[PDB]
Structure formats: C-alpha cells, structure tokens
Symmetry: C2
Amino acid sequence: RDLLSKFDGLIAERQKLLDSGVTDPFAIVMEQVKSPTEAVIRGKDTILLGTYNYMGMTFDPDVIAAGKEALEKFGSGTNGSRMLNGTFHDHMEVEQALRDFYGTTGAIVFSTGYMANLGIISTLAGKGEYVILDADSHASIYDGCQQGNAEIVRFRHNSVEDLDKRLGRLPKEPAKLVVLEGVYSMLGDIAPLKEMVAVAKKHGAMVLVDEAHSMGFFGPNGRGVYEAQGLEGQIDFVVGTFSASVGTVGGFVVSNHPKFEAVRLACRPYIFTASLPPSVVATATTSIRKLMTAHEKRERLWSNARALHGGLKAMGFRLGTETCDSAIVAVMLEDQEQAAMMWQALLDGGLYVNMARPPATPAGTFLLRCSICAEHTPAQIQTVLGMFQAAGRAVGVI
Amino acid sequence: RDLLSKFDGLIAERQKLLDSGVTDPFAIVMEQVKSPTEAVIRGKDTILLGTYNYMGMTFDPDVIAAGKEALEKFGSGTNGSRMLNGTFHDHMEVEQALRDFYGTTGAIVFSTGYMANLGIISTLAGKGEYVILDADSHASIYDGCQQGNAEIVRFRHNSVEDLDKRLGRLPKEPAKLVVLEGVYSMLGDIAPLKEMVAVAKKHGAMVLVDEAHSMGFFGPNGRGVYEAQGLEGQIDFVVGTFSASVGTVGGFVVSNHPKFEAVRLACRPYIFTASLPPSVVATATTSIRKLMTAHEKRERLWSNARALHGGLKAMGFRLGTETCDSAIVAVMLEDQEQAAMMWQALLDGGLYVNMALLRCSICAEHTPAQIQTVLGMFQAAGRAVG
C-alpha cells in the first residue's frame, strides 16, 4: 500500500464502466472545435450540448481580436501575483468592466472561479463565525468552507423554512455569511432568493450569491437571478466566473461594501498565485462589455432553452425542473447504467452531453446535463430533440 | 460590526503608509509592457527585475504565434472541466509536452500552480496519514495541508537533521508525503535534496518536490534541482507552474507512478474548475518544447545572475546567499522602513524590484548593459538610503 491505494475504488468503478462497453466519459477530446455548438470527437462531427458557453462568446470576432492584440502587445503571461508585478493594463480594465456590468463600486478578479469561492468564503468568515450554505452548493463553495475556520451549517436544498430554522438556532452575536446560488449547476433550478434573503437579513446575516450560471440572461441588465427577483442593493457579495458566458477563464467577486478593497490584502488565493495572462483578461473585458447589450443572443438562448426543456418533457423524460427556469436541462435517469447507455447512444449518434454522478450531483442522482447556448440554430435543436427521442426509446427510458 | 470589520487593522496599516507619502507596493500597474525586461509604470520607463519570467518566454515569436493560432482555431475558452467538455487538442498536447520535458509517463495539468499544490497535497494524504514539509514552504503548500485531513509535521528550514528526527518519531505504517522545494523563492537558496530524499526514503515516505523556480536552467535537461543533484528516478512527484519559465498560467504535477492517472478521478481542484483556454495551453506547449533546448537563454540567465550577485555583494549589500545559486538574488535590509525607502528610490530611478528584503530576479533576456545599469542604480540608492 502507498498514498494512491486509496484510489483503488475509483479505478475499479472506471474500469467496470469501460468493460461494460462504454467510452470513457472522463477522457473525451475535442480534436477540433468549429464553433460554440460543433466539435469533432474521434473523427465524428458532433453537436455540443454539454458546455457553459451560454452566450456563445468564445468565437466572437471582437473578443478574438482583443485576445490576439493583447498577446502581441503584452505577451503570453504576467509572471507574477497581482500584489507584485502581475497587474497590467488589462487586469485593471477587466475589473472596471465588472464594476460597469454589475453597477458596483467593488470588483476583485481571481485566477479561477474555484479560487474566488475558495478565497472569499475562507477569508470573510473566520473562527467563531458561521457559514450557512445550501446543500446543493457547488464543490468550490464547500471547499472554501473546508479551507476556512468558521462553523459550517448546511440547509435543505431550496428550503426557506430550513434556512430560517437553522439560522434561528445559532447564537445572535457572531457574524454570519449565508451562501446561495442563483442557478444551481446540476439540476438547472433557481433559488428563491427573494425569500431566502429576507430570512438571512432577519437573522442579521450577510449574503453571498453565486451567479455563474445566469450572467447576461437574467435581470434587466443581465446581472443574475438576484437582479431578476428585485434584490438590487440587498446582496452583499456576488461571485461569478469568466469561464461560462464570458468565455475565457477566471473568477470574480463584486460588492458595494466600502471596505471591499481590503479583501485583496487578506485573501490567500488572490495573493499567492500568478495573475491571468493579458489575453485572458483582454478577451474577458471585451466579452463582458458586449454582454451588457447582447439582446439578440439573450432572446435566442431563452427560445432554445424553452424548446429543449418543453420537448424533452413532452416526450416523457423526468427532468430536474418542472418548468424551464434556466439554460441547463437535466435529464434524470434511474442508475449509473441507464445514464451511461443513454450517453453512449447520443455520443455515437453525434451529440455530446454531460453525464454526472455524485459528488458533482445531488446524492443518489444519475443525470445527463444538457445546456443550450445562444448560438444553437433551430435546425440543431430539432436534430437534438429527435436524437433524444430515438435514444430514449432505444434504451427504454421513455 | 460585520464580516469586514476584521480588516480594520490592515486598512489602518495601509493608510499609515499612504499618509507617510510612500508608494503603495501592492498597487503597481504595468501600463505598458514592452518586453520581458521593460515596462512603463506611472509614465516612467522602468527595468523589470522583480518577475519570474526566468527564461523570457513571454514575447517569444513562436509562442505568440501559437497563441494566436489557438484563438483562431479553438476560440477564447473551453467552457468546461477537463472531466467533461474542456479537454481540447491542445490540453492533450501540453500534457505530452510535460511527459517529454520531464521524461515521465504521467502528467496532469491544473488551471493554476496554486491549485496543483492545493489539490495534490490534499488528495494524496488522507485521514491518519502525514504531510511533512519545510517551515518555509510556499503558501499554496500550507493551504493544501489545511484543505486536507492529514496530520501535518513542519520541520526546521533546510534542516536534514530535523527532518530525520521528526520522521523517526512517527508510526511506521501510515503512509507519508515529504514535501520539498528545489529553489526557495524568498532568499533564492537551494534545498539539500540529495540528503533530504535519502532521509525520506529511509523512513518509507513518498517525496514531492516543487521545481517552479528551476525550470529550464537546472540539470542537464532543465528539469530542476532534483535532476542537478542526481535524483532522477527517485522523486515520486514533481510539481511545477506554467507562470514562471513557461510564461503563461497554470500548474502541473508529473510522476512515473502507475496509478497516477487516477488522481484525475479524485482531485477536487482538477475536477471542479474550467480547463485553461486553448491559447494558454498552446502557448505553454510551444514554450515547454523550446525550453528543452534553450541553451542560449540558459547561458544568458546564469551570466546575468552571476553579474548581479557578484556586483551587489562586492558593493557591500548583505545578500540571502553567499554564492550565486539561483536566478533569485535577495538583498537583506534591517527594517520594514529601510526596505521601503530602498524600494521607493529604485522605483523612482526606473527599476522595479519586489519588496517582501528586496527580491531581484534576473531573466535570460536582460542584456549586459541592463545589468550594469541596475548595478549603478543599486549603488546610488544604497548610498542615498545609507
């Protein structure tokens, strides 16, 4: 035995999957990527329906031009932390783009979304304080709790009552952070933020909302579920990513708190890593600014989401949501095996979707996560729906 | 009071600094960057001597061409985890470049170096196991220990004897990870890896070495201090970064362990984050391959290091190292105050260094003329500050 013996279970789970005849779902390679919606996988032209490119920004000509120009003018990397030599023109620009996008005085960019959550949660809530989070919070949120020294309180997913009951039992004086997501990434449901935030404030807690899966397509300015639900000015901190709608890599937190800049001085995952390459922050700047007025894309996104959700529901699939609440549609299957055969059939027929099992999914569920984007065509959506009906019938799901 | 009241002390410390008239060292902006060694800061043409661009790869024409081509062919981002839709052609290419660079069967890329250390440490060592690390280990290594559930054992900096004593007191059966750095980033001194690794193996521990500050310029193949000290085949895991010599962003771990691929299945900071943009992994691929044979750059790096270290030493500065052992030269000062006045004077005269000590790092693309300029700037500022 050595330090890797602990992986023998995972190794066996993967091998069972291979031996059953399934392609390794964790080893897919996009050999070519033609557009936000099309790739080539093992020589097969394939529709992509398992990405977070909600607004199809990764091939935008202005975004690409900005990335090429930044490479030319500032090089391939910064070779330093933001706190030392790693803040270039474009890092300042992207933080201002966020201030403009969210209408906040404060914006701090991190090198990944994972690190934004890891850092913000572990830095804000210290020893003798509390972090109160939804059961279905992203892994990075749980990891931030593990990194910090605060008391952790989990409440039942989307339960306003359970949040209220668990908060009410805590001592009043210690400071508290309630952590919520606008759109939950596994099932594609939304949080009842209006009601949750009222409960948080009643118990004197600050509120952080993760709007990674809503950017550009919820609320009048595209700021997120919090904005759609009328909570402008009541959310202490909003966390997001550059990897989804924005189409690059990186994380961020925005706020109107007057002391928010001091987070830079204290936050280890901000301090102890190199800043993002100039091309990454330049592409992100251009993309964020275009997202402020991307009305046509937003309308195509919602039309595509409604088409997919409605179509899969009508044909008999059990979905994660009863109504079309986001750009993620989760098809729920009975077991690992049924999910795998479904996934394989779609893949072999020219459609890529995400297959998920826990820890990435809520315990016990086995699902296919489909996500649409603004650049899927009506023809592609009709193709996807047909592929799902045929595969669902063949595997015996519907 | 709220969750940010805890920062009132830091806020006051920063404000005292500003009120004293002195430039905020944590708010420097490189408004223009002309080359690996030259920037414009507050309108002033400034020599950079405080970066980790050791091999000056960030403006390499082949690297830049590869980044432009990747943007063109694959777009600005992947929009997904490596475990799902985020593995494109260039992610596979960069992992193979690492296998070729290090001569290993295994190579796993992470979205940052910080996350490579956070993830590898917290995933390898579980409950009832031990992580044994040098007192002066990088923050990311400490953070990996905090993230995991293992027992943590810290040993006195650079002390082979203390490592041996602390290991000897532990129970034999539980698995153990000894974590070392090749080049220590503050002072620029080197670990006695040959001796430390012998001790680790005597006590049955696995060994991880961080070679972030040695890549391309230690050992016959540029693999690091471990390679230079004859430890090829004896190091279980090597961790590095894409942000220093490689000149982009990202982290990695390499290994010959036959189960190494299974780390992908278990490691949370690998799984639960988007993969790097195509341009980042393409630039990294090209840079890594060039680093395998970058003889002219390596020679300039070492010549520059020797010139700077020798010059500052001869001038009467106390340095972190008695001999020129790495590309980092640390000038040691008495006070927070003396360091700050020194730093300010260098900055105002057209030279950027890191204040932590003043940490000077040379790169392969500094010219002999620039090094002589730096030396003059140091003498003048050192005399002016006393």
